[PDB]
C-alpha cells in the first residue's frame, strides 16, 4: 500500500478507539476550534455590543458573570448577516467588541455537528448496521440550526441568534414569545408533546423492562449483575411486561412486538422535535403562533377577554421592555 | 463582586465530601480479592 492508501485505511479503520472517518476529518478540527474558542471566550472575553447600539453586554466569567449569567454573546446588529471572520477586523480588540467569537464558534460548531451526523451514518456502514441513528440525531441538529442559523437569516442578523449561555438562552426564549407567540404555535406544541412524551415513554419503557427482569441474582447484590454483556438470551420477560401494561390500560394499547415498541420510542420524540425545529425555522419568517386577541366580543361589541388576551398582556410586557434603547420607530419589524 | 463569603467553602465541601466517599468505596472495591 502507498501512503494515501494507508492513510485511507487508518481514517476509515473500524479499530480506532474513536472512529475518525471522512466526516470526522472535517468534524475533528471544526469542533476543536469551536470548543477552544468557546472556552476561552466564556472565561475571558470582554463585553460585546450585541445590539449594535454601543451598549456592550458582558458575557465572560472574568468580567463579572457566573456560570448561570455567562455567555458568549451574539455578534453585533451592525454586522447583521455579514460574515465577520477574524481577518475582517482591524484588530482582535475590534473583533472582540463586535462579537466575532460568536460567529467563529457557531459556524465551526454547525459544520462539526453536521459532520457528527454524517459520521454516525459512516460508522454504521463500516459495522454492517442499519443506517438511521443519524436520522434520529437530525432532530436536535435541526434544532441547533434553527436557533443559530435559520432564525438569524429570517430576521436579518446573527445578533438575534440564541446566545451561547444559560441566561442568554432564556432571553432568546422570552423575546421569541413576545415576537412570535410561540406558545400558541402548533409546531411548538407538537415539540412539547415530543419532549414530555419522550420523557413519559422513556420512564415507561425503563420501568416496564426493569419490572420484568428475570431473577438471576440474590438480594445482597445489584440485579444488574444478572445481565452479562453480549449474552444471547433476553434479560427480561416481554410477555410479562406486555401482560402487565396491557392490563394497566387494555390489551391492544400495549406493544407485544419489541421492534414496533422501539420504533415508536425513536419516532415519537424525533418527529415532535422535528416539528419544534420547524416551528423556530418558520417563525424565522414571521409566520407566528395563533392570534386570538379580541376574538370574543359581546352583543354590543365589548371585548370579552379569554386566556389568549392575558397571554397577550404578558407578551406586551416582554415586547415593550426588550432591548430598551434599540428601537426608534413604533413597530418592531425584525 | 460582592459574593457570599461562604460560597467557596460550601462549593468545595459539596464536591469533596461525596467525591471522597465514592473514591473510598471504589478503591476498597479494587483492593478486594479477584
Amino acid at each position: 500500500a502507498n501512503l494515501w492508501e494507508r492513510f485511507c485505511n487508518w481514517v476509515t479503520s473500524t479499530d480506532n478507539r474513536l472512529y475518525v472517518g471522512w466526516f470526522g476529518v472535517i468534524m475533528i478540527p471544526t469542533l476543536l476550534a469551536a470548543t477552544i474558542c468557546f472556552v476561552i471566550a466564556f472565561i475571558a472575553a470582554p463585553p460585546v455590543d450585541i445590539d449594535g447600539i454601543r451598549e456592550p453586554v458582558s458575557g465572560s466569567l472574568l468580567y463579572g458573570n457566573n456560570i448561570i449569567t455567562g455567555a458568549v454573546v451574539p455578534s453585533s446588529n451592525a454586522i447583521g448577516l455579514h460574515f465577520y471572520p477574524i481577518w475582517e477586523a482591524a484588530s482582535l480588540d475590534e473583533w472582540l467588541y463586535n462579537g466575532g467569537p460568536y460567529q467563529l464558534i457557531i459556524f465551526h460548531f454547525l459544520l462539526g455537528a453536521s459532520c457528527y451526523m454524517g459520521r454516525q451514518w459512516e460508522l454504521s456502514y463500516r459495522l454492517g448496521m442499519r443506517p438511521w441513528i443519524c436520522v434520529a440525531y437530525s432532530a436536535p441538529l435541526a434544532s441547533a440550526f434553527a436557533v443559530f442559523l435559520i432564525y438569524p437569516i429570517g430576521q436579518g442578523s446573527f445578533s438575534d441568534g440564541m446566545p451561547l449561555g444559560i441566561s442568554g438562552t432564556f432571553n432568546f426564549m422570552i423575546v421569541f414569545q413576545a415576537e412570535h407567540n410561540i406558545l400558541m404555535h402548533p409546531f411548538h406544541q407538537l415539540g412539547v408533546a415530543g419532549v414530555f412524551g419522550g420523557a413519559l415513554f422513556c420512564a415507561m419503557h425503563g420501568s416496564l423492562v426493569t419490572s420484568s427482569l428475570i431473577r438471576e441474582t440474590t438480594e445482597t447484590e445489584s440485579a444488574n449483575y444478572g445481565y452479562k454483556f453480549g449474552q444471547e438470551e433476553e434479560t427480561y420477560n416481554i410477555v410479562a411486561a406486555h401482560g402487565y401494561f396491557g392490563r394497566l390500560i387494555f390489551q391492544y394499547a400495549s406493544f407485544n412486538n419489541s421492534r414496533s415498541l422501539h420504533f415508536f420510542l425513536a419516532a415519537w420524540p424525533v418527529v415532535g422535535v422535528w416539528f419544534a425545529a420547524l416551528g423556530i425555522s418558520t417563525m424565522a419568517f414571521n409566520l407566528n403562533g395563533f392570534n386570538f386577541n379580541h376574538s370574543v366580543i359581546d352583543a354590543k361589541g365589548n371585548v370579552i377577554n379569554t386566556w389568549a388576551d392575558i397571554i397577550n398582556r404578558a407578551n406586551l410586557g416582554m415586547e415593550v421592555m426588550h432591548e430598551r434603547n434599540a428601537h426608534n420607530f413604533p413597530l418592531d419589524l425584525a | 463582586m460582592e459574593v457570599n463569603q461562604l460560597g467557596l467553602i460550601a462549593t468545595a465541601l459539596f464536591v469533596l465530601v461525596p467525591s471522597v466517599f465514592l473514591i473510598i468505596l471504589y478503591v476498597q472495591t479494587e483492593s478486594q480479592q479477584k
Binding site: 478507539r17 474513536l18 472565561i43 472574568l62 452479562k228 453480549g230 | 459574593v3 460560597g7 462549593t11 464536591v15
Partner: peptide, 30 residues
C-alpha cells in the same frame, strides 16, 4: 475566587471525560 472555582469544576469534568473514555472498565463478552 468564584471564577477559579467555576473553571476548576469545569476542568475536573473535562479530566473526568478523559478517564471515563480512555480508562473505562472494558466491556467483555462472557
Amino acid at each position: 475566587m468564584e471564577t477559579i472555582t467555576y473553571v476548576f469544576i469545569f476542568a475536573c469534568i473535562i479530566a473526568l471525560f478523559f478517564f471515563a473514555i480512555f480508562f473505562r472498565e472494558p466491556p467483555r463478552i462472557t
